[PDB]
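Hey all, quick one. A colleague (J.T.) asked me to put the chloride ion job into the tracker so the inputs and the structure tokens live in one place instead of scattered across chat threads. No bug as far as I know, just bookkeeping. Sequence used:
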Amino acid sequence: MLDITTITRQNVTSVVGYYSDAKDDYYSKDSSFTSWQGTGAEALGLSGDVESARFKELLVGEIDTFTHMQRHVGDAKKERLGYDLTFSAPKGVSMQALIHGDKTIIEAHEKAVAAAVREAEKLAQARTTRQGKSVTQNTNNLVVATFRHETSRALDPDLHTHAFVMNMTQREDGQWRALKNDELMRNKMHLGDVYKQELALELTKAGYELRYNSKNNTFDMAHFSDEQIRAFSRRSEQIEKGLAAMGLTRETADAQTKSRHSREEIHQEWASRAKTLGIDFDNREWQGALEVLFQ
Ligand SMILES: [Cl-]
Ligand SMILES: [Mn+2]
């Protein structure tokens, strides 16, 4: 699944949790959850973990002490800072990785994001002029900062990476200019399919059987069912939002509504909820069908 959110000066505070949302995550306790990616990042000498100060300079176009982008033509509130390409795993893949466990699933997801980012670079464009005419140029380079989180805002298992594409690309003349985002935005389905294809291949290498849905071109873990996942999500929402049954009297409804923080405690709730629905996360590795191959 891929969602694209444009980050502007107006909504920049929406990224405030890019680091803190990972605070108590299992697979980044002693390991990186961020990375620099893209040929543009290489050009800037950026690799490995994303240092927040450098992220913030590039967010506003400060490439170096002597190179400062100017991109806002008009209302500075509308200046685009970058594009959050949020890649989320299928829910059952998330449940497997975050309730049962296997760091290989996290690595598969990050390989799939990196493959989609490499493909996104082919869509990078910038504007320039020739003979006084505005023209478009294919630049083949992006600057991307990735942030991996394990949970949704509702504290569901929800493995996802925010692949933050900076609003910059390096032109042929060597100048850094705003990204002309048209081709990026209109290839959301292609980039999401690249992620899905690479995730499915990496999970197959690790011996997980996948079930395929042809109508939606999606897949999930084969050893528990869509109905089981949907029931898990329903029960999760009951607990998260404190939903109560209806009461025949105001007094009973009031009392039921009134009645209804460690990751370890949250994990136990996940595990207990899945057990009660008959989910068995102990899959028969390297057994079963290959439904997603050649899809
Ligand atoms: Cl097993
Ligand atoms: Mn997140």
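Adding what we noticed when we looked at it: The longest strand covers residues 157-166. Residues 1-294 form one domain.
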